[PDB]
Structure formats: structure tokens, C-alpha cells
Design a protein around this nucleic acid. Sequence first.
RNA 1: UACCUGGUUGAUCCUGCCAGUAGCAUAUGCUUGUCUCAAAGAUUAAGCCAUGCAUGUCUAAGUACGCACGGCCGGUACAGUGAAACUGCGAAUGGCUCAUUAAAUCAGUUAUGGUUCCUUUGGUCGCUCGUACUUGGAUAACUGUGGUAAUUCU
RNA 2: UGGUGACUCUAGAUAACCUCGGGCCGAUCGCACGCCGGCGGCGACGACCCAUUCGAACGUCUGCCCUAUCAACUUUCGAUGGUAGUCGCCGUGCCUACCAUGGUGACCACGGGUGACGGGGAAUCAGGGUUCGAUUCCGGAGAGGGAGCCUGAGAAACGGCUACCACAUCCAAGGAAGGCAGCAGGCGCGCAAAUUACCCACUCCCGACCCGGGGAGGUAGUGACGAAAAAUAACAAUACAGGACUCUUUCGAGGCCCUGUAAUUGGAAUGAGUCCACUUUAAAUCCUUUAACGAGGAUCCAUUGGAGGGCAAGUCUGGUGCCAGCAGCCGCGGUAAUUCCAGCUCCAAUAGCGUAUA
RNA 3: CUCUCGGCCGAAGCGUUUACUUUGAAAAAA
Lengths: 180, 262, 124
Amino acid sequence: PVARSWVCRKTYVTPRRPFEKSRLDQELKLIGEYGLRNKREVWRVKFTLAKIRKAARELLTLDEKDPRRLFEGNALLRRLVRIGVLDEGKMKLDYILGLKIEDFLERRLQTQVFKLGLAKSIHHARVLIRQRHIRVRKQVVNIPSFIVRLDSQKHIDFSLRSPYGGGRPGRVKRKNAKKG
Amino acid sequence: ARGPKKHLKRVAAPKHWMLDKLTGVFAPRPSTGPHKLRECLPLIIFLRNRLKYALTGDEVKKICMQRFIKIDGKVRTDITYPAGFMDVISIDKTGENFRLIYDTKGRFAVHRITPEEAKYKLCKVRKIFVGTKGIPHLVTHDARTIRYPDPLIKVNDTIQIDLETGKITDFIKFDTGNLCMVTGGANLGRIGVITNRERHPGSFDVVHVKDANGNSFATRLSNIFVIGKGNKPWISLPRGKGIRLTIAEERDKRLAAKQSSG
Amino acid sequence: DTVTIRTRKFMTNRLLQRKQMVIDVLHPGKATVPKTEIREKLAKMYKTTPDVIFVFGFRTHFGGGKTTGFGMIYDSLDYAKKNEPKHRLARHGLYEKKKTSRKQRKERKNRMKKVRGTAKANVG
RNA sequence: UACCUGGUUGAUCCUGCCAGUAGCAUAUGCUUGUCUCAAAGAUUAAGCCAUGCAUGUCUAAGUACGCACGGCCGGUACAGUGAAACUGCGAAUGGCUCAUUAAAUCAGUUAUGGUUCCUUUGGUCGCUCGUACUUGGAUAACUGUGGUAAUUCU
RNA sequence: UGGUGACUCUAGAUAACCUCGGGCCGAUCGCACGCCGGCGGCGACGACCCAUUCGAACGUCUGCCCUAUCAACUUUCGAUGGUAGUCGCCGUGCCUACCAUGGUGACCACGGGUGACGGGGAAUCAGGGUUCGAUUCCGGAGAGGGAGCCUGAGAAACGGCUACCACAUCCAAGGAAGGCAGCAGGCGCGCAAAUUACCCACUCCCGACCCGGGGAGGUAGUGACGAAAAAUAACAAUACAGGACUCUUUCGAGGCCCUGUAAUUGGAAUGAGUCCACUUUAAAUCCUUUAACGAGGAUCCAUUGGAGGGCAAGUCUGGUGCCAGCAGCCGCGGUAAUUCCAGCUCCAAUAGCGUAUA
RNA sequence: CUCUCGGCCGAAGCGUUUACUUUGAAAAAA
Ligand SMILES: [Mg+2]
């Protein structure tokens, strides 16, 4: 007997066919376009979308005025609107099945800091975030997979203690300044 | 097991205690007392977990051994004492009085009362018999033995007890049209008026209760506690007033609150 | 002078003769500030002497300009000595532990079981 | 994601299996920078165990003639702290393991109007028409004499 | 009198009884001190009984894997029932005496097997289903194997006792003492599993107890069981293999946008490490926070399997010559081997990836 | 679906008995 918790999950599922040529080209295109590290980072978002589509398909088989359909349908739709994947004027349970992986991949902090002009590429954004140069609402974040909530889009800035903001220069400029 | 048990595991503790998983392996096992193990709130989980007057279980002992807490007029220094439904907790140092009343979600509420309301409590009637030399005897839900009661008081009624003397001041019979609270089952914490009672001899009776908003439910007769005569309760009620909100209504009532803030 | 102290969730514990609160300390470009330094800024904040102020459990947030901890202010040093944990009094220098070991005491305990009478005392 | 592919023939269409494919649990091989949580002598041997520890306990309130103590006051029965010992309570909880066990155990549901129950809480505790302003004998701790190679022996 | 669905219930009355191995009816203790020699206020410890709480113990209805190369089973020695009693806390063939001949079974009794503790649950999964559950929660059982007891409210107790069976310890040979399926640790067995560490600070439990104790429990150590996040580089200027895109029909201009040998230049940014200090904590360690040092290219160097098909990716070059070996399957290898042994190149997942087995 | 009672309704009998369907309360936490 211990005061410990053993609850955990796996966040991805592997594909059934390991060497499907059409799927290998489709997934590398996403990796290259959004600057991902490995195929496991595509199967994670794809798993999350697969679980969202499965809840919607189960709610869509209930009565249109089923009390559980109107409670957990509104919650799912509101959750999808909040992060910016679904539109404000499309809060219908049939528009969830029209969602794509690219919608979910566009809300990553890595994509957003690049699309806001902080970084010169999608690979510069990765290192900028991992090197503690970016903050969201006074909090320093160094997780590139941080999903940006809609009313956080305006509060992504350079960190207050970084050479790219008002901070001191890094070790290299300091060392070369004393070189002469 | 070769004898009675003295421990309680945290996952096996009553859910309405609201104990978290990762604080410890054990939970306070209530002492033997007037209330059941699964229908009581020990003094430690009330002084530490609800009121936050203490941060650890050692501080609850330091408050208790200073003789500050009175349960229905008597000082209890046991920190796992089984307080329960309708009890009055008095802290004279801070001038606080509380009554243990279920809320609509089925959990004991932090219901503060006035010093005047702390002078009495309402007790259900469990047993009536006749003892030696023909003396009538009561037994209540609080394990109180009260002799020489009125002959009109029967089982399933409610009496009012003055905590200073322990004597009956008034009573309410069980009949249709009387207010009641549910003290168990799936309707625990709900308040409504009795409308019907269907009798099943050799088995459990069933009582039908209707809310103020028009919602009707049913319970077993052992889970009914008559509060007041008619629509008027005899004790002060918690914030929810016994009405169970649906999850959609609760969501709308919560969302409306944050829009008001600004 | 850039270190700032704020308190929240304040309540007076008349049952334990103290005030208790949560402390947020802001220190944008510094390390986690010492508890002795925090104790002085609460003495001025609450107009008392820092002998009756006990602070513990300070955690710094990621990135780092804010630390959150807990604080207690007692009415008197006597009440502090009565109610405070004896490990939190030793930090202030008001309690000395015994310099033995569980193994030492336990082995000594089991040797006295073999001896009977006052001769228990003369056992090493 | 409600999925198949290779192999019998000169070639064809089938039956049918073999092999491939994905998870999941044990072991194992090679490799291994950061950080959070986290199983761990079950499988076979419920086989065998050196050593240490895992169960004790005093409040104002059962019994203090240990000067063992610094110190009162000296006719004060007992100022106080207090080892030891008598008395009371606990040790029937917890921890471990899965050998036995096939309507047995166990799960949902019922009954005790067919039994017991330390403790907690409440009642009861001049209800009986018959030395008391205090009753009797011991025995521990302690002192002293010992026995045995040896024990928490006596 | 009162109550149940229902008493042979509770309460009442009468005649007696009342166990010496005996039934209750207080010869106990502390604190404050007082009112008119008497009266006294707060508690503590004990008391037959009643009720209550924690239960426990017996019963009610339904439900379990394989097996007929197990079809009849039980009844002398209680099997089904009746009557009266013994014993038991009590209801009962629980046991005894006297009676009766019953009771179960293809709707699978009786017997055997189980790598069988049972559930809550776990893996897989279109829908149905299949397999697992020794394992931290609930219930059961046991303390080397049988058996029997004392104390106590509670035990057929084993960190209690008494025997027998099997092992085994000290000895002056007379005797005495044993029980890790508790925490560490050792041996053995194996394909198969960690420290003879620190603490009662947390969660709780026990006691005469606000103070004492707790290998329960907590904290560190070992730990690629398994799960989550996430480094191993980024940018600019050059000049091309160059590429698209605009104009010049064409030569060409390209500053508009792009990829790479870049053994071409260039400073900018950062941990991983070393390491003041604070913070954490019972005391520490770790994470978080912060000074100082800390990055150019054989480095601060990513691995594991493959390249005929299934199945993504070389009939490249060198060696061997039905040998050595590969190969889950088809198959490769007999002097020009797309398959072996290597170099180069290529591709799959990636701090992970092969193999065996259920 | 109805005979007696308490101030046009309820308390009490079933309608042959079920299977089925809907509802209710009772169903440890993890
Ligand atoms: Mg191919």
C-alpha cells in the first residue's frame, strides 16, 4: 500500500501497415511543412483528432433533444472554438467531421511565433521557443507543442530577459566584446 | 479477522468526505458513537479539511485538547468523533455555530447558524417501547434514550430537543403535506413536501416527495426526515434550499456569474 | 529594492493564536530570496517583530520572477513555542534535537528486556 | 480505418492451410544526453534461513519510605521531579503470501420474530423494609544468602 | 400499557426458586474552596441491566472452467425425515435413543482434472466476441505439516503455550532453546525480480496518554517494466549543380522566391556539463531560481535493423564458388551471386530498435 | 375495474397467472 497513482495513457497509435508508400509521402509533407521532429509527432495529433471524431459520431446517434447530446455537444463545440480550430459561426455537430489535421497543427506555438514574424522560418521558431526566448502572457514557455488558445494570440512576445528583448546579451557577445 | 477492525483506507472512506488520493494511505476511522461510520463527518475532517483552522492532524489535536469545540453542548476532545446529521458545533473562542446539513450534491455543508438556533436540534424517532414498571421509552437517530414522552409521538416522527436539558419541546408527526429532507440514497440532500406513502408489508415502504419547483421523486421510508409542518422548515436551510439543479441549468447559472464580473 | 511582498488568503486563527496567509514574492532578476529576508519585510508590513514570524514552503515558478509560500504570525513568542512544530523552531535556533539514532535507541531498548529490576538502568 | 499480401499449375479458377501484418505481457541482445511519473523473488521451491530491527504504554486524577536529584521546615503522615515494581489496557489491528478451496469461496439480494458483542453515546445507578469518621491477610520493587556450563531460569 | 404483516413480543398479576466453582445494590482518586458540627460544586475510575455504534456468526434467491475412455450416486460407520433430549451464544442429524425409508440425477447427479483464491477490474475490438485477473481496494485462507488448548469481549492466536511428524541450534553429554508466506539481507531454484540505508516531519493506529511507540507508513538508493514532455543545431553574405518565376522571339538582365558539395566566410543564440548561493526537507538529494566558466566540424560524433518479392530502399564495386553461409515463406549460393562476407550508397523508426515465448 | 370509510377524491379488494416492454429506488471507492 502506497500513496501513489498509476493512471497514465499512451498518446498515439502506430499505423497498421508500416511501409505504405502513399502514407509515407503524406506524413513527411506535414513534418516538413510544420517543422516537426519525428513521425510520432504526427500520430499524436492524428490520435487526438481520431478521438474527437469518435465522440461526435457517438453523439450523432442520439436523439436531437437528448439531454446528454445537448450538454456534451455544446462542451465539445465550445472547446473546439476556444482553441481556434473550429469557426464561431459553425457550431454544429456535423461540422466536426469536416475538421483536418492541418487545422490542429496550425495552432502550435511553433507555427504561431513564425506566422507572427518573430522567427524567420519554421525551424528558427523551434529553436527560439526551446531556447527560452518566447513568453505568452508574462509566462515563459519552451514547449513547441503548446496549443495556443484563441484569446492568447495577442500575448505572444519575446521574453523580458532575453537578448532579443530588453535583456542582457548572451555569453558570446559579452566574451567577444572583451576580446578587442 | 479475529476481531474488530481499527483502520480505514483512503479509497474506502465515504466519498462525500472529499478526500484526495495522494495525501496518504489511511483515512480517519470514526470512533464508535451516535452516528454510523458511513453517514458521519469526523471532527478532524471538519476542523482541518473544511474550515482550514488547522493544517495538519497534529494541530487538530491542539485545538481539541484546549476544550474549544462543543458538539451539542458538550466538549469532545476526540478528534475522530462521529458528528452527524442535525448536530450543532460551537466554537466559543471565535463565536461560531454550525449545523451539519446536507447540500443538494449530497455532502455536508458549512452552514453557520445564530447562537439562538444552536439551543435545539431536531431528532427522528427510531424506537418506542415500554420498560420496567410501565415507563415509555424513546430511541432516536442520535442514540438518545428519552423516557416519559408524549403518547402521541410515534415512530418516524420528529421531535425538538433542547440541548441544555435534553427534553422534548415540540414534535411533528409523519403525514402527507409535511416538509422533509432526504438523508440517504440517490436523493440525498433534497427537500420537498410528502405527497404519498405506499405500503408494502413485509418489505420497505416508499414515500413520494415533490419539490417547490414541481419536481417529484421517491425514496424509502427510512431515508425521510420530517423538517417542518407544511411548507415551513423548523431549521435554517443551506444556500441551495434543497432544489437539485440540472447540469445544463448549473452550467448556465455558472456562466452568467463570470459575465457579471468586470 | 525590486523584491516585493504580497499576501492573500489571510485569516486570523484565534484557536491557535496566530494569523496565517499565502505569500507571493516578486523578484524579477534575482534568485529565490531568503526566508530571513522575507521575514523582515512582513514585520514592517504588519507592524510587529520578526521573532514571531514563521515562513515555509516556498516554490519558484518556471521562468522565474515569482515565488509562492506560506506564512504565520503569532501573538507572542510563548504561543509560538507552544503551537509551532518543533522542527520549525529549530530553524530559528529555539530547539535542540537529541543526537542519537533509531538503531541506537532500539538496540538499547531490546537489551533492557533481558534485565529485570533496577539493574535495567545499568545497561549499555 | 468495418483493410489484407506471398506460396500447389505448362497456364486457369477454387478449397485449404502455411508464412507474412498490428497491439499486448515476460525474458533477453545491442544502444543510451535532458526531464516528470513509476512496476519490481508471483510463475519454480506455501523451499531453508546467519544477523539487526518490526509492540508498547502515565495523566491534576490506582499504588512512591530508591536521598537518584538541586532544594523547602524543620515535631509538619504525604513539598516536587522521578528510575524500579505491582495494577489496568493493548498485543485478535496492521504487514505478507495465494498452498488449500468447484454451489465450496465469492457477488448482487434478503432475514435474525434464531444469537453474541470489549469500547463510544444515552438511560439506569435512597425502587429491596432486612468499624461505617475506614475492616483483613498477604506479596512485588528493596535488603541479604544462594544454585546451575548454559536461557527474558529461579 | 404499547407495538408488528405476523409473537409464545414488551409491560402487568400470582405461587415459589435463586447455584459458596456465589448476582446488582461504590470501604476508590484529583481540583477548588466555601454556606449556615452539619451541608455542598466541578471531574476521574469503576457497575448488573436496557438501547446505540463497530461488527461477527449463522441461514434465503440467482450465478462458475474442462471432462462420459466418469451414469447412476448416498444409506453397515447419519444418508432424507419424525419424536424427545445432550451439547452449543442460538436455529439446525450438531450429536444420541427410538421410529419411517427416504434424498439427488441426461435440465448432467456422483467421480476426476485445473499452470483454479473469488470479485471490483486489464488487453484486444466495426457490431458480436476471445483471453487475462498471484498483484497495493472488498471478502476468504494460512503462518514448516497435522492436532489440542490457556487467557480474554473477541483467537482453536503461532513476533502465545502443549504434544507428535520433518528439519535444525548450544552443551562440560546432565540438559536448554526453535519457526522471515513482516523490513532489509543470505542460500537454493531458476529465462526470470532492488539497500543488512534515514525518519516518525506527513497519513493514520495504539496506550494510563496534548508529551511515549510504530521496517504500518513516509524519504532517499538500485531501476530502458511501463507511461508523459523534449536536445543533437539556427541565421546572414557569397559562388555555383542549379531550380522555378518576370521581361527581352533569341543572346541576357534578374534584388523576386527556393534547394544543396558548400573540406566557402561570419559573428549571434543556447543548454548538457563544472559550480557560489538561495530555495526544498525531519535532515538532505532532485526539480525550479540565480552569479562565474562552458560550442565549429574527425565535435559536446545516435542507434537498431535492412536494400529479389511480400515490404520502403542498388542486376553498384571487391571476395567466395551447392563450400562458407543467408533464408519466418517463396527461395539465394555449382567462376559475370539484385539475396552470403565487406566497402560505398540508399530507407524504416528513432533515445530507442531487434529476438524468443504466451 | 369496483363494493365500505376520512374531508367531487384518497384508504381497501383484484383483473387467471406469467413471460415481454417502459418507469422508479437500491446498487463502495478506485
Ligand atoms: Mg520495393
